[PDB]
Amino acid sequence: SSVKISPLKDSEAFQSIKVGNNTLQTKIVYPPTTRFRALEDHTPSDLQLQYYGDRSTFPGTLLITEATFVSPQASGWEGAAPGIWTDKHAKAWKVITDKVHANGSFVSTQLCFLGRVADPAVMKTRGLNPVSASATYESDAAKEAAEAVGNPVRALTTQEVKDLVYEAYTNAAQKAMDAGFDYIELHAAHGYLLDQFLQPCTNQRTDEYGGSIENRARLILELIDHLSTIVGADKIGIRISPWATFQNMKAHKDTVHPLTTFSYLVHELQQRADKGQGIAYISVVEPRVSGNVDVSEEDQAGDNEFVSKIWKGVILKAGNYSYDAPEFKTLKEDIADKRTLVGFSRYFTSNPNLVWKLRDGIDLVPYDRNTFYSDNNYGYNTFSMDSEEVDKELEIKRVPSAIE
Amino acid sequence: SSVKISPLKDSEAFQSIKVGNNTLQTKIVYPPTTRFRALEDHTPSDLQLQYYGDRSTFPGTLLITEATFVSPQASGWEGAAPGIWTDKHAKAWKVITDKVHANGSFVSTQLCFLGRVADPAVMKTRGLNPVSASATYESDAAKEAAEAVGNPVRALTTQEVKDLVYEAYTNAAQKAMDAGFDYIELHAAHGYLLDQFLQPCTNQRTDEYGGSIENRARLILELIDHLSTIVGADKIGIRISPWATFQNMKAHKDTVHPLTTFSYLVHELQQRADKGQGIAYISVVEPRVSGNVDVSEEDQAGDNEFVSKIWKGVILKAGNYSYDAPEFKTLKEDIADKRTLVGFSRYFTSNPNLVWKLRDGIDLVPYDRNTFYSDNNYGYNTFSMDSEEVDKELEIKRVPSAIE
Ligand SMILES: Cc1cc2nc3c(=O)[nH]c(=O)nc-3n(C[C@H](O)[C@H](O)[C@H](O)COP(=O)(O)O)c2cc1C
Ligand SMILES: Cc1cc2nc3c(=O)[nH]c(=O)nc-3n(C[C@H](O)[C@H](O)[C@H](O)COP(=O)(O)O)c2cc1C
Ligand SMILES: C=C(CO)C(=O)OC
Ligand SMILES: C=C(CO)C(=O)OC
Ligand code: NA
Ligand code: NA
Ligand code: NA
Ligand code: NA
Ligand code: NA
Ligand code: NA
């Protein structure tokens, strides 16, 4: 059903805030949202250009791109997700960042790497193995699937982990700058590669990158440090999901509790800020949501208050913020400290003008989960059109094409 | 009476436009509007800080400051107008431009110089004479007033005209950059100094700065050229009022018609643009208004179509644009070419949120001419408050004070 909402115009959500070297004019953010409308070779498409453009119209909005692969080894979905490792990728993304910028808005790219959850058949076509901190699978079914095609998950060697820092993420960061991105965001959430390194259920390494809380965090902090020297700390973000059990992360049932793991990481980030190397923002997923799934109040085992107590800079929070609509009591509490951004993913899919709707209390159009991950324009850019002009069958047939 | 208006949200008025090196998100502009709420020594005041801040809230709005004196010799009003010639002036203005910038908006400073209309008693206190291109007065009364205090208008010498370029306007431009202004605008309108040079009723010089159309334009083009080498052409604007008879400019009754004078100037500006030295914008006053006065359709002797035909860059037009409210037929025609900005001065005085009102068709609050030029906060920042919280007598007593 459509969601009745009270206007946020006079709230902290429309007070300006400096994030790194840019100033946002709204604290409402579009978080990274995988949609699979990139081209087959992972170049961003004509559909994506319009999609991000349509969401940039409140001047001074921050948009964060869907998970974007840092390298071929970083990939592994059957759906067509974008990349940022070739000149072709960067040039196409630049058309998109140009369009967002022309509206006075800003864009961060979420750099991802799937790791142990990469599809083994897909990776086999690249002549690649699924890789991770350790040789583990999210399920027995995944293990059987990988071994059945003779392409098991394997642990990255120490040198390969160094390669992530000095090659894969370095090149991705360089391409991201070529592409005109205002920030790069390390995806360290939701059980993908960086989360696999951070937490013990996924990392049993015996080199410098595992075997202790500090060792497990080492790769992530090494990426933060190295990339800061390339692009500047003011252009860096990171996303974490301490409480999530998406893709079989054990979370509060792990041998090290998320409060320990993630407080360690956040405090190390704050110590860098104290030394003049403060990253632009930390993005955190609220315990109401785990990956792309809502979590019952019953199953919630912690909260993200620790991030606020430990980190002094900008925080982006997201996860079912309309649960207490129309009055948005929780959203208002969460932004009261004046350094907190609030993200809406699912409602931004069906409301390209979401910032405007939230500003003036306009009923939210319900989203369509059925078309979250499909391969064509129906349920993608169609939310920007009047229905009477949406030819559904034509749009279902409209697959992504090259920009211009 | 309050003005009913139709929403401009879906019009060209909310399409982005690059002006010099900045992109505006609305084409609605606040034009230079003298209000006399600066400090006695011409430093910008606490009241001005709030006043410009209040008008910057639609992100990506261009605000142009009230006439701002380039030097002591440039002054001459009894009211307290601001200046931009000392470090103190620049530092105070920087607080204001900082505030506008934090809202994602931009600010141009209108550089002025009164010339022959400077009050002779005021100038006598500075040990200065009123000066001009030639020794003329706007009226016999002005002549009698100046001679009665033994302080006649006098013609600037050739060297003094050079001093305007290399000293007065050079320093003002430098201070404007220190103050964080995005543009500097030469006031060549309304019968002030630069207009006095351009037109023959006010300029009978026999040196290189008078005696022909080209010679009369020489100072203005010399300022454009010299200041372009200092701040860049992308940071320069100019205002002209071809049809105005404000302060006794003869206009269409002069010995050279405004179409001749101003087409010459605009074409010279376009030739500079063809060579890569295109200034950011030309601001023109529509024939509906002369200075601060409306002009009857009967008395209108020309239009500004020539500027559009000759100049290929950004044009700002202003002058009673709400005359055909609610539908704004003329405004819409004028912005249809996609390179034209539209200014509202008088309605911006009583509607600090004017861009927002025009966007969504909110009734315009009528302005109060009685408080256009008074010395205190009543009728100045009071338009941003709810009435029930406006203590009128306290506000009348609130004169400008130092920022912070
Ligand atoms: C279809 C879909 C795709 C998503 N893709 C990503 C992603 O690529 N990276 C990421 O960090 N989170 C991703 N998420 C999680 C969202 O960014 C967000 O945290 C979550 O949906 C909760 O916010 P919401 O309640 O406003 O939707 C995705 C969520 C959905 C529903
Ligand atoms: C009180 C007042 C002060 C003004 N001050 C200036 C000024 O300093 N410089 C200038 O170029 N025009 C000045 N103008 C002219 C305006 O910028 C504008 O061109 C004129 O008012 C017509 O626009 P409007 O009908 O929207 O008010 C002033 C006008 C008024 C009414
Ligand atoms: C599609 C999801 C859902 O959380 C994801 O995080 O992709 C990186
Ligand atoms: C106050 C006016 C009215 O046009 C003026 O132009 O000041 C520079
Ligand atoms: Na737009
Ligand atoms: Na825009
Ligand atoms: Na908070
Ligand atoms: Na503001
Ligand atoms: Na703002
Ligand atoms: Na036009």
The position carrying tokens 């301490």 is A242
Angle at B292 between CA B156 and CA B257, to 5 degrees: 60
Chain A residue numbers touching B357 (CB-CB < 8 A): none
Listed in sequence order, the DSSP H helices in B208-339 are 213-231, 258-274, 305-310, 329-335
> Hey, how many other C-beta atoms are within 10 angstroms of the C-beta on A322?
17
Tokens of B135: 């020794």
CA distances from A108 to A280, A376, B182, B401 (A): 11, 24, 26, 42
Tokens of B255: 């010995």
Chain A residue numbers touching B102 (CB-CB < 8 A): 16, 23
Whether B361 and chain A come into contact, CB under 8 Å, resolves to no
Please name the residues in contact with A292: beta carbons below 8 A apart, sequence gap of 6 or more: A246, A372
CA distances from B176 to B93, B166, B185 (A): 8, 15, 11
Dihedral angle sign, alpha carbons of residues B283, B287, B293, B294: negative
Residue B117 CA to residue B131 CA, distance in Å, equals: 9
**Helices and strands counted in chain B (H then E):** 14, 15
Residue type, B295: V
Backbone phi and psi for residue B107, each to the nearest 5 degrees, phi listed first: -140, 135
Whether A353 and chain B come into contact, CB under 8 Å, resolves to no
CA distances from A261 to A185, A223, A251 (A): 19, 17, 10
Domain map (residue ranges) of chain B: 1-404
Question: Which ligand is nearest to the Cα of residue A26, counting in written order?
Answer: 9
Whether B15 and chain A come into contact, CB under 8 Å, resolves to no
Residue A46 CA to residue A37 CA, distance in Å, equals: 9
Residue A252 CA to residue A301 CA, distance in Å, equals: 7
Longest dimension (CA), chain B: 61
* Ligand 6 center–CA B247 separation, angstroms: 40
CA B305 to chain centre: 20
Tokens of B329: 């037929």
Q: Give yes or no for a contact between B235 and B184, defined as CB atoms under 8 angstroms apart.
A: yes
**Nearest C-alpha to atom 13 of ligand 2 is from which residue?**
B33
Tokens of A230: 């390339």
Backbone phi and psi for residue A165, each to the nearest 5 degrees, phi listed first: -70, -50
Backbone phi and psi for residue B274, each to the nearest 5 degrees, phi listed first: -65, -25
Residue A207 CA to residue A215 CA, distance in Å, equals: 8
CA distances from B299 to B202, B285, B296 (A): 22, 15, 5
> Hey, how many other C-beta atoms are within 10 angstroms of the C-beta on A214?
11
Write the DSSP symbol of residue A275.
T
Backbone phi and psi for residue A22, each to the nearest 5 degrees, phi listed first: -115, 150
**How far is the alpha carbon of A150 from chain B, nearest alpha carbon, in Å?**
55
CA A189 to chain centre: 8
Write the DSSP symbol of residue B156.
P
Supply the DSSP string of A105-170, one letter for each residue: -EEEEEEE--GGGS-HHHHHHTT---EESSS--SSHHHHHHHHHTT---EEPPHHHHHHIIIIIHH
Q: Is B238 helix (H, G, I), strand (E, B) or coil?
A: strand
Tokens of A147: 């071994």
Q: Give yes or no for a contact between B143 and B135, defined as CB atoms under 8 angstroms apart.
A: no
Give the CA count within 13 Å in the CB-facing half-sphere of A403: 22
Whether A23 and chain B come into contact, CB under 8 Å, resolves to yes
Pocket test for ligand 4, best of B33, B64, B77, B190 (most atoms within 8 A of CB): B190
CATH number of the domain at B1-404, please?
3.20.20.70
The position carrying tokens 């970083």 is A74
Q: Give yes or no for a contact between B92 and B403, defined as CB atoms under 8 angstroms apart.
A: yes
**How far is the alpha carbon of A102 from chain B, nearest alpha carbon, in Å?**
7
Residue A378 CA to residue A371 CA, distance in Å, equals: 7
Residue B79 CA to residue B89 CA, distance in Å, equals: 17
> Hey, how many other C-beta atoms are within 10 angstroms of the C-beta on A166?
12
Query: How buried is B215 (Cβ within 10 angstroms: 0-12 exposed, 13-18 middle, 19+ buried)?
Result: middle
Residue type, A227: L
**Nearest C-alpha to atom 4 of ligand 2 is from which residue?**
B33
**Nearest C-alpha neighbor of A206 from the set A136, A259, A158:** A158
Catalytic residue, candidates B30, B52, B137, B192? B192
**Nearest C-alpha neighbor of B168 from the set B151, B182, B156:** B156
Residue A108 CA to residue A88 CA, distance in Å, equals: 19
Please name the residues in contact with B265: beta carbons below 8 A apart, sequence gap of 6 or more: B188, B198, B217, B220, B221, B240
Please name the residues in contact with B3: beta carbons below 8 A apart, sequence gap of 6 or more: B322, B325, B326, B347, B363, B364, B366
Backbone phi and psi for residue B372, each to the nearest 5 degrees, phi listed first: -60, -45
Residue A96 CA to residue A106 CA, distance in Å, equals: 11
What is the four-CA torsion angle of B281, B286, B292, B293, rounded to 10 degrees?
Answer: 180
What is the four-CA torsion angle of B146, B147, B149, B154, rounded to 10 degrees?
Answer: 60
What is the four-CA torsion angle of B82, B86, B87, B91, rounded to 10 degrees?
Answer: 0
**Which DSSP helix (H) or strand (E) runs through A247?**
none
Backbone phi and psi for residue B246, each to the nearest 5 degrees, phi listed first: -60, 140
Cis-peptide into B326, omega within 30 deg: yes
Active site residue B380: no
Write the DSSP symbol of residue A218.
H
Residue A257 CA to residue A134 CA, distance in Å, equals: 19
